[PDB]
Every structure is written in C-alpha cells, then in structure tokens.
Amino acid sequence: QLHYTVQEEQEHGTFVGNIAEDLGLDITKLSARGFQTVPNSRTPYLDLNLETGVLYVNEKIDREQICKQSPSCVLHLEVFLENPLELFQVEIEVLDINDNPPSFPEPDLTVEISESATPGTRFPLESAFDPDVGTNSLRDYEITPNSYFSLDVQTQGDGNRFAELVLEKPLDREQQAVHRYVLTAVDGGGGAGLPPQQQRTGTALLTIRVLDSNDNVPAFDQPVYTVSLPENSPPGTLVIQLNATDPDEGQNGEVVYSFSSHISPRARELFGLSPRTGRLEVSGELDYEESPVYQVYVQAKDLGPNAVPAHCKVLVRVLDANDNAPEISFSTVKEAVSEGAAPGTVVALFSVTDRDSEENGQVQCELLGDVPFRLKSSFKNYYTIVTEAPLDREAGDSYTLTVVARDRGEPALSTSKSIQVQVS
C-alpha cells in the first residue's frame, strides 16, 4: 500500500508519486499488463499516466472542501495489473496550508452590561471560525487595550476557541454609556515539508452598551432654603422652584416632589407643591399677625425601584404689611364739664393700639375741629383730652370731640372715635 503526500492547492500537473517505480514495474511492460485505475477509486483530483506510471494532480485540491475540519485527509486510489491479476492500494495524504483567516459571523458585536455588574463577571462573545486545521486554525483572541475589560479564552476542540469578556473594574453609565473596542482573532501560522506559513487575522467591532441602574439619589443643592414673602401674598404666588437632580435614566431618573409627613397641618393648608415640577407656591392667606414663619418639609424621590428619598426644608418668612388700622379705646368720659373750668381741666382718657409691627403699628393722634380742647400724653399711646381756655354754656353748649388715630405705614390707615361733652 503506497503512501504519498500532496499540498492542497497545487496546480494541475504537479508530481504526486511514481507508482511504477515504487512498485518495481518496468514501464515497458505496463501496456501489456493492462495497468489501469480501478473504476470505483477514480477521482477528479488525480491523473495517472498509464505509459509512465506517474501520478499527477489533476483538479486543484481544496482540503477545506473535501475534508472540512477533519484532522486527517486521505485520497484513496487503487490500481491493478492483469495477467496475473494484482491489485494495489494508494493512499494520498492532503496536507493543509494556511489559506484561510479566522472569521467572525458578523462584523459588529454588541454586548449589554448592567452598570452594577461585579468585576470578575464574564460576558461571552461570538467566536470566530477558521476553516483550516491544526496549528493553522484559530489560536487566540485580542482586544483593544483598555482598563475595563480583558479576555478569557478556552479550548472547545476541533480547532475551535471560545472567548468571554472579563469585567476588570466597575462601569458607570452616568460617566460613559457606550464602550467601543476592536476584537481580533489570529490563527497559529507562524511540518511534513511545507513552506513557511504566515499568520492570518480576523476582526470584529465590539460595542458595550451600559445599562442603567438606579444608583443615584435625587439631590437638592442645599438642605435648607429660605424665602421671604409679603403677608397677604395672593394664592398662586411662587415660593420657590425646587430642583432635586437625578442623572439616572428613565423612571430611575424621573423625580416627584411631595410633603414630608412631619409637615405642620397649617403649612399643609397654606402651601401647595407640584409633584412633577417641584414648584412650591402659596395656596392660603399668609398672615404675619398669625405667624412670621412657616416650615415646609419637602421630599423628592425618583420613580425607579429601590428609590431612596431625599429631603429639604423651606423656611418661608412672612413680611408684615399694614393691614390693621389703629384701635381707639376710651377709658373715661365726663359728659359734663363745669362752666368756669380753668384751662387744663381733664375731660376724657383713652388709648390706642395697632395689631401691626414697627412703623405699621406706630400711631399718631389728632383732635379734629376748631374746638377749645387740647390733647396731652403722659405715656406712649395713652392720651388725655383737656380744656384750653374758659367756656360758655349758651354760646357753646355741647361739644362733639372726635379723635383720629393714624398709623405710619404705606398706605397709612386711620380710625376715628367721637365723644359728647357738654357745659353744665
């Protein structure tokens, strides 16, 4: 049983083996003996010269086609002579050359990884396939140098190899949502009398899409905000536009605002908070004389799973306006004054109050008319009405004295009160 070898991809007419010689047959007797190829073992890849006994390549041999990824490739030829009958078997071994690169099944790979994946986690890649065999097949994978991912490769047999990405450090979608790298696969070309083989290489783009986790908590730029507003500010008045930022994606990053449970029942009445905009506004009557300040406790919380609430406090200081007029109150009024009352004779006592504060609560007083009475004051806001001259029971019998109390706000407010006095 003769044994020959032939490189795949040799051109037509290449020498394969001298069958006549290696069997001891003189070429001069070949024709007489009916030197011929057995019918079943004919192959389009081999020509046998029957006059010389020499085997030549006929059609070029592609090992990948006849033998796929088999580790061994052997064409079986059989020849025979007649008179006597003699049958000879011939095995022709086809040697693989490195005429194919590793190849990926698609030019762009995409791998999706949660930004909360732990370092050490592995993500499989689509493997490249190299149709050559043995050392000419796939040998290793490589990735663009980078600090986030390395490669792990293992043997699958039949010259195949499988790679995974190995996560080397945490990802942060909020810092970079997509990583792009170049993936490469090289075979092992670089042995039964073969000429030098060169290494071949295949390529694929690799896209890492980083999936969002709800790992950012909404954030107010301050823990307390202070706002001053005039009392009687009308409903709808803006207090403050809160903003609790959240860089996450989707519902993870959508923030809704509401009142914390610690909020006073009065603040809940007087203020209203837009759940989606964070707009805080007045919805009731702010009355300084009721309270100069309110504490609004707000919470913000995103709409994702495992959301964590954030908190801030709005201090609403109320500013006093001049919305109360002075109050006059008489404590004693002698309706009758004697005719000859000397000047300075006291006729009435009274006091004034104003529910406002500062200038808005400061009161000045005047006596109206051209009557012969004068105002005196011993202490702030306490007054007396005295006479100023002698009198007359008939010319001036009864007198109406009216006091006007005026505060010092803008616009000012004033009040009046009258008393009836008569000469005995």
Ligand X SMILES: *[C@H]1O[C@H](CO)[C@@H](O)[C@H](O)[C@@H]1O
Ligand Y SMILES: *[C@@H]1O[C@H](CO[C@@H]2O[C@@H](C)[C@@H](O)[C@@H](O)[C@@H]2O)[C@@H](O[C@@H]2O[C@H](CO)[C@@H](O)[C@H](O)[C@H]2NC(C)=O)[C@H](O)[C@H]1NC(C)=O
Residues that bind ligand Y in the complex, under the rule CB under 6 A: 241, 243, 245
Distance CA 2, CA 89 (A): 7
Question: What CA–CA distance (Å, rounded) separates 241 from 278?
Answer: 6
Which CB sits closer to ligand Y, 199 or 241? 241
Structure token digits, residue 248: 């996450």
Among 135, 203, 295, 384, binds ligand X (CB under 6 A): 203
Closest distance to ligand X from the beta carbon of 189 (Å): 9
Please choose, from the candidates 10, 79, 85, 74, the residue with its C-alpha nearest in 3D space to the C-alpha of residue 40: 79
In the list 144, 156, 176, 201, the residue contacting ligand X (rule: CB under 6 A) is 201
Tell me the C-alpha distance between 398 and 25, whole Å. 170
Of 22, 37, 38, 62, which one interacts with Ca ion (CB under 5 A)?
62
164, interface contact from ligand X, Ca ion, ligand Y, none, CB < 5-8 Å by kind: none
Q: For residues 272-331, which are near Ca ion according to CB under 5 A?
A: 287-289, 302, 320-324
**Cβ atoms of 362 and 408 closer than 8 Å:** yes
CA angle 203, 207, 209 (to 5 degrees): 165
DSSP letter at 196? P
Residue 36 pairs with which residues in a beta bridge?
80
Integer Cα distance of 135 and 186 in angstroms: 11
334 near 297, Cβ under 8 Å? no
DSSP 8-class letter at 43: -
- The answer to whether 197 contacts Ca ion (rule: CB under 5 A) is no
Kindly write out the interface string for residues 112-151 of this chain, putting x where it contacts Ca ion by CB under 5 A and - elsewhere: ------------------x-x---x---------------
369: which 2 tokens? 């008319």
Instruction: Work out whether 354 is an interface residue with Ca ion (CB under 5 A).
Output: yes
CB 68, min distance to ligand X, A: 24
Site string for ligand X, 28-67 (x = CB under 6 A): ----------------------------------------
Q: Scan for tokens 């930022």, then name that residue.
A: 245
Tokens of 244: 């609790």
Q: Which is closer to ligand Y, CB of 243 or CB of 414?
A: 243
Q: Residue from 199, 260, 338, 418 that binds ligand X (CB under 6 A)?
A: 199
Q: Which of 43, 103, 184, 232 binds ligand X (CB under 6 A)?
A: 184
User: What is the β-pairing status of strands 346-353 and 382-387?
Assistant: antiparallel
> Which residues 82-111 are close enough to bind Ca ion by CB under 5 A?
96-100
The interface partner of residue 130, options being ligand Y, ligand X, Ca ion, none and the CB cut-off 5 to 8 Å by kind, is Ca ion
Backbone angles phi, psi at 175, to 5 degrees: -100, -40
The stretch near Ca ion (CB under 5 A) out of 207-215, 274-282, 327-335, 380-388 is: 207-215
Least distance between ligand Y and beta carbon 405 (Å): 48
When the beta carbons of 278 and 361 are compared against ligand Y, the nearer one is 278
The torsion angles phi and psi of 325, rounded to 5 degrees, stand at -90, 150
User: What is the binding site for ligand X (CB under 6 A)?
Assistant: 182, 184, 186, 199-203
